[PDB]
Amino acid sequence: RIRIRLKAFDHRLIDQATAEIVETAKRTGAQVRGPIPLPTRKERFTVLISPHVNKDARDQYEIRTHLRLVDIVEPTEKTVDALMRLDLAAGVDVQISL
Amino acid sequence: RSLKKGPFIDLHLLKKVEKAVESGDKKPLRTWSRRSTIFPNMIGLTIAVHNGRQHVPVFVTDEMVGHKLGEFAPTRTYR
Amino acid sequence: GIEQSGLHIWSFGQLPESYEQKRGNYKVKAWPALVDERDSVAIKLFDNPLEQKQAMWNGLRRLLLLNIPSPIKYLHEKLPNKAKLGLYFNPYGKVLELIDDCISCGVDKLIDANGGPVWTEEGFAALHEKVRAELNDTVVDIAKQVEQILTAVFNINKRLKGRVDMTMALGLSDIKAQMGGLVYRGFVTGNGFKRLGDTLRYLQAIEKRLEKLAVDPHRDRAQMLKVENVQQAWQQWINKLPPARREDEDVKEIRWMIEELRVSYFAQQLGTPYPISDKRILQAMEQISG
Amino acid sequence: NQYYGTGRRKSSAARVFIKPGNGKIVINQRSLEQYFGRETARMVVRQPLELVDMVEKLDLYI
Amino acid sequence: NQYYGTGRRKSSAARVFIKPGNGKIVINQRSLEQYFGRETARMVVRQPLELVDMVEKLDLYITVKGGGISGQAGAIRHGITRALMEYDESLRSELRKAGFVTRDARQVERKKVGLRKARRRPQFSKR
RNA sequence: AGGGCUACACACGUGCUACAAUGGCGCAUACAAAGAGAAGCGACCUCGCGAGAGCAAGCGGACCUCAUAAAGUGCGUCGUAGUCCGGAUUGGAGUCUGCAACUCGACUCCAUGAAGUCGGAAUCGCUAGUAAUCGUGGAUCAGAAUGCCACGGUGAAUACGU
């Protein structure tokens, strides 16, 4: 009922984010649906490494954007007042859809 | 082939053409806008279109009006 | 055999109000009614006059819509297509079932205006000729009002979905709950003709919540605490009643009392049919606790 | 949904009862303005709420 | 009480359910002669069942997802050769001896930079 | 501001499409992966033969959209004919983008119908999901790919030996 979505570039960091969210949710509420993982936005780049010549000399990079969902079932004012102002994670952002 | 909604002309070329044809043919009109389309009000008139260095004079007959100004002025000179 | 199946035309005459037989010393009573089969109508016996009335009501709706010469396709053809796109605002998608529900909301409105379900073929014909002559064109109001309530659903949806904040999300969760309570599968026949205007008033209150919500959560927070406390009172009171008293109508108006209370909190430019406060909801509930 | 706290000092005892609210406080059936006249006492009664920013989230019967 | 297996192949994976029966096969709520019977690989799906005993005495509801036609068929094959694991090593040994328990490791691999495809290098000229 | 970078008696490089019957065409029909999308992808409905146009949701996206994958299979047909091959080129008329498409876009409708019937000296790539062949997406980019980078379908032959 409260769809909690996390996007990061670091899977480790977003696990410490999800652990905090789900643990506070279990602590002051009930019925979490776990840290739902979704397919990573695996975004592909390739560029040239020589400034003038050598079409065949390239480099390849990627972005691994990691997705998470939590989906709290009971939107009780207590647990949402706890889950707010306390996520505070560095390299994630949050979606709180209904 | 182009915009259906309005065959194109340059605005200043349109107003020059009107002030020429309503006052009568008296001087060959020099211009740069090759992007413009020839209209039936231009028939019988003498234009001097820029090809990059000079202006080629063109006289406007009946069947000019289905074509543009830029086709009648070669800018690449091949011997 | 009065109780049959596969029935499509009221040839029953004066349908029995009750069925009675005798076995030795003692009698046996029953209540015969119609039954909807989604393909045809049947007649089955029942042991309670109220649920007999509900079953005969449903079978009468099916028999009536079968006996009327194509009101369904008539309204499909004659209905405005902009209104049909308003129906296509449906999150469920299907529009034909929505028109089925709105025609049903015409049918019960006309039966209530004519005086309820009757047992006789003469009453059947008297209601049937009039619902033929009038059903094809009274449901234009129902269709356009479902169009308007779907425009309200459209606007509230475009407010709820998107970039949302948790101070907003406290209010949006309750708005979602109100949306689920009001609009659902066949909501027009769910609430009935008498409440269609009142639902538009409810969505006007839902609209008027959001301007105060976006400028101050705290006043909205306190008023939603008031609504929350009467709502949990509603739950804990209606869940201890006897099961018939969990489904009767006189216990059913208290949800609409709560919605009128929501109107009286959030949008007083629109008004309520009668003055309402939390004291009035509580005097209602301990008045009808029985 | 009534929760309990107690507070004892030198020869003193206070009972406090928690409600969700808007920021009203009543002590001994009078307001805190007609009660404590010293502003640091107002500070020490508000400072637990002001520490964890529930200052207008709730009401409290004390 | 149901024989189960899961097989995989190139871009494909299959879930197979088997029970004691009398010969029926159902692929994605359709028949094998409808789904492979008009083209190749209609026999790789059945052949381990004829090699093992009890060829008629079972019937099976199978499904497969992903990959092409032959990849789906090979996924079915590996799924069945697994799914008879309730029948023990007494026939699992000869099944591996025929070489059917091994998951196929071949996958289509990546295009490289400076290459038209997998290994085909564009034409080298002028020496 | 316009022209030029896009010229043209020619020579070379790398590719695309063919010279067809293991196929051309019509109908029906089954199976993928991966990626993109807010000045964006853009359902459905309606118009047109179509490019597209009107209306217009859903989607910041395992939801919606791009998106019908195509070679594959079953039928009918062609019948070895420069032939129902190939489509160059050219004429008329349009669709979109963009202030604007002549120099100098791309795409669609009709008509046309080259050369080309497997290519000398020579020469390239490839050891297994590889070669070969069939489509799909992306970046760049308003519009612009036979280019480049990815994705999957079917799926080889041969390796005695130095």
Curated annotation (Swiss-Prot), chain A:
Select a single GO molecular function from the record's annotations and give it. Answer: structural constituent of ribosome
Query: Is Transcription among the key words of this record?
Result: yes
Q: Which GO terms describe its biological process?
A: cytoplasmic translation; regulation of DNA-templated transcription elongation; ribosome biogenesis; transcription antitermination
Q: NCBIfam families attached here?
A: PRK00596.1, rpsJ_bact
Question: Which PANTHER family does the entry mention?
Answer: 30S RIBOSOMAL PROTEIN S10 FAMILY MEMBER
**What's this chain's function?**
Involved in the binding of tRNA to the ribosomes. Part of the processive rRNA transcription and antitermination complex (rrnTAC). The complex forms an RNA-chaperone ring around the RNA exit tunnel of RNA polymerase (RNAP). It supports rapid transcription and antitermination of rRNA operons, cotranscriptional rRNA folding, and annealing of distal rRNA regions to allow correct ribosome biogenesis. In complex with NusB is involved in the regulation of ribosomal RNA (rRNA) biosynthesis by transcriptional antitermination.
Q: What is this protein called?
A: Small ribosomal subunit protein uS10
User: Organism source for this protein?
Assistant: Escherichia coli (strain K12)
What does UniProt list as this organism's lineage?
Bacteria, Pseudomonadati, Pseudomonadota, Gammaproteobacteria, Enterobacterales
* Gene of this entry: rpsJ
Swiss-Prot record, chain B:
Could you say which protein family the record assigns here?
A: Belongs to the universal ribosomal protein uS19 family.
Q: Which keywords label this protein?
A: Ribonucleoprotein, Ribosomal protein, RNA-binding, rRNA-binding, tRNA-binding
| SUPFAM superfamilies xrefs | Ribosomal protein S19
What are the GO BP annotations of this UniProt entry?
A: cytoplasmic translation; ribosomal small subunit assembly
**Name by which UniProt lists this protein:** Small ribosomal subunit protein uS19
Looking at the keywords, is Ribosomal protein present? yes
Briefly state the protein's biological role. In the E.coli 70S ribosome in the initiation state it has been modeled to contact the 23S rRNA of the 50S subunit forming part of bridge B1a; this bridge is broken in the model with bound EF-G. The 23S rRNA contact site in bridge B1a is modeled to differ in different ribosomal states, contacting alternately S13 or S19. In the 3.5 angstroms resolved ribosome structures the contacts between L5, S13 and S19 bridge B1b are different, confirming the dynamic nature of this interaction. Bridge B1a is not visible in the crystallized ribosomes due to 23S rRNA disorder. Protein S19 forms a complex with S13 that binds strongly to the 16S ribosomal RNA. Contacts the A site tRNA.
The UniProt entry's GO CC annotations, sorted and at most eight, read: cytoplasm; cytosol; cytosolic small ribosomal subunit
Which GO MF terms are attached to this record?
rRNA binding; structural constituent of ribosome; tRNA binding
Q: Which cysteines are joined by disulfide bonds?
A: none
InterPro entries cross-referenced by the UniProt entry: Ribosomal_uS19, Ribosomal_uS19_bac-type, Ribosomal_uS19_CS, Ribosomal_uS19_SF
Q: How does it assemble?
A: Part of the 30S ribosomal subunit. Binds S13 and L5 and cross-links to the A site tRNA.
Chain's gene name: rpsS
Q: Which PROSITE patterns match?
A: RIBOSOMAL_S19
> Could you name the domain of life of the organism this protein comes from?
Bacteria
Swiss-Prot record, chain C:
Name the source's superkingdom: Bacteria
Q: What does this protein do?
A: Not yet known.
Q: What is this protein called?
A: ATP-dependent RNA helicase HrpA
Name the encoding gene, please.
hrpA
The text of the family note is:
Belongs to the DEAD box helicase family. DEAH subfamily.
Swiss-Prot record, chain E:
TM regions (residue ranges): none
**GO molecular-function term, one example from the UniProt record:** structural constituent of ribosome
Q: Which SUPFAM superfamilies match?
A: Ribosomal protein S5 domain 2-like
Q: Name one Pfam family in it.
A: Ribosomal_S9
- PROSITE patterns reported in the protein's UniProt record: RIBOSOMAL_S9 (PS00360)
- Keywords on this record? Ribonucleoprotein, Ribosomal protein, RNA-binding, tRNA-binding
Tell me which GO cellular component terms the UniProt record holds. cytoplasm; cytosol; cytosolic small ribosomal subunit
Q: Name one GO biological process term.
A: cytoplasmic translation
Please name the PANTHER family in this protein's record. RIBOSOMAL PROTEIN S9, SMALL RIBOSOMAL SUBUNIT PROTEIN US9M
Summarizing the function annotation, the protein's role is:
The C-terminal tail plays a role in the affinity of the 30S P site for different tRNAs. Mutations that decrease this affinity are suppressed in the 70S ribosome.
Similarity comment text for this entry: Belongs to the universal ribosomal protein uS9 family.
Q: How does it assemble?
A: Part of the 30S ribosomal subunit. Contacts 16S rRNA. Cross-links to the P site tRNA and weakly to the A site tRNA.
Q: What is this protein called?
A: Small ribosomal subunit protein uS9
The uppermost taxa in this organism's lineage are: Bacteria, Pseudomonadati, Pseudomonadota, Gammaproteobacteria, Enterobacterales
